Enzyme design. Sequence first.
Site, PDB file in Angstrom:
ATOM      1  CB  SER A 103       7.821  41.245  -8.045  1.00 20.26           C
ATOM      2  OG  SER A 103       6.778  41.582  -7.150  1.00 20.26           O
ATOM      3  N   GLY A 104      10.917  41.856  -8.051  1.00 20.51           N
ATOM      4  CA  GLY A 104      12.201  41.425  -8.514  1.00 20.51           C
ATOM      5  C   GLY A 104      13.137  42.555  -8.863  1.00 20.51           C
ATOM      6  CG  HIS A 113       6.712  36.912  -6.021  1.00 18.98           C
ATOM      7  ND1 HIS A 113       7.334  37.954  -5.358  1.00 18.98           N
ATOM      8  CD2 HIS A 113       5.917  37.467  -6.960  1.00 18.98           C
ATOM      9  CE1 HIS A 113       6.884  39.103  -5.893  1.00 18.98           C
ATOM     10  NE2 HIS A 113       6.062  38.818  -6.889  1.00 18.98           N
ATOM     11  CG  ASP A 153       9.797  37.221  -3.048  1.00 18.58           C
ATOM     12  OD1 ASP A 153      10.110  36.346  -3.907  1.00 18.58           O
ATOM     13  OD2 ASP A 153       8.904  38.096  -3.209  1.00 18.58           O
TER      14      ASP A 153
END
Lengths: 52, 234, 4
Positions: free
Chosen positions: B185-186, B42, B88
């Site tokens: 995120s990530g 994402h 994701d």
Amino acid sequence: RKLCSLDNGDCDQFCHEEQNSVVCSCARGYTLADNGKACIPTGPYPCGKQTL
Amino acid sequence: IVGGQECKDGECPWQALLINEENEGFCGGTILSEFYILTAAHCLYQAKRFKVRVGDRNTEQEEGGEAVHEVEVVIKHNRFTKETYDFDIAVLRLKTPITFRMNVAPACLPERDWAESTLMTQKTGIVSGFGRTHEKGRQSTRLKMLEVPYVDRNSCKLSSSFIITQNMFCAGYDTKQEDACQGDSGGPHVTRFKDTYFVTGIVSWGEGCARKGKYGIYTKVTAFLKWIDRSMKT
Amino acid sequence: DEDS
Ligand SMILES: [Ca+2]
Ligand SMILES: [Cl-]
Ligand code: NA
């Protein structure tokens, strides 16, 4: 007999049981020691170790 | 990261920062090897062009130790969907290899079955990032880390207004004000086992940040170990 | 595949 459920089979890193016996292994960039347990880094920044 | 504490130099050396066109961080990543970064699919939608910074301890000053790497290839899971945030996951191949050094080192990928039976049954993991320090707040200029308890799947599904797939897991606290957040995120969720840190999650989504009765939701790396391996063979 |  060793078991992965007890002290991780004495393995430093990965433990699995094959034909009812513990086999240890290591992440990329480590060599399994002669004792079949320990994981020895092959270089100065092995994975998963904080830097000193 | 909401709550937690600053990483000391050398303590979170696998963290990467995805930086946009204005050199601002918007997502994390995990260093896997000299050429590869693990991140969230994402994050790819959140900047049209981005690079990867490693070794940063303070985003608002060049201190020495930082390096920026351009991305050669993005490898995105083809089943990623914004409907649910399932799948994701993405991998970045860099144009130039990372020089491992103080504060810059890879996290280990674990063996898949042992990860499921041994790592995922540890009490806690460590999540890190430069993201927001409160829900709807500001990003941290300093790299933060946070210990998050694993949360069992049944409890997490009960807590969640959105589907928890087999490709996700939950970690964090019911009411304690500690969690990952937007901008994280990530980045890495790692689990320590006998003094080695293994990649177990990718910061993915949540309902708010540190909200009462909600957890952080993470991509389950064990479900993608073969995919990650293959991603380095395109 | 299912993992592409
Ligand atoms: Ca800096
Ligand atoms: Cl570098
Ligand atoms: Na909560």
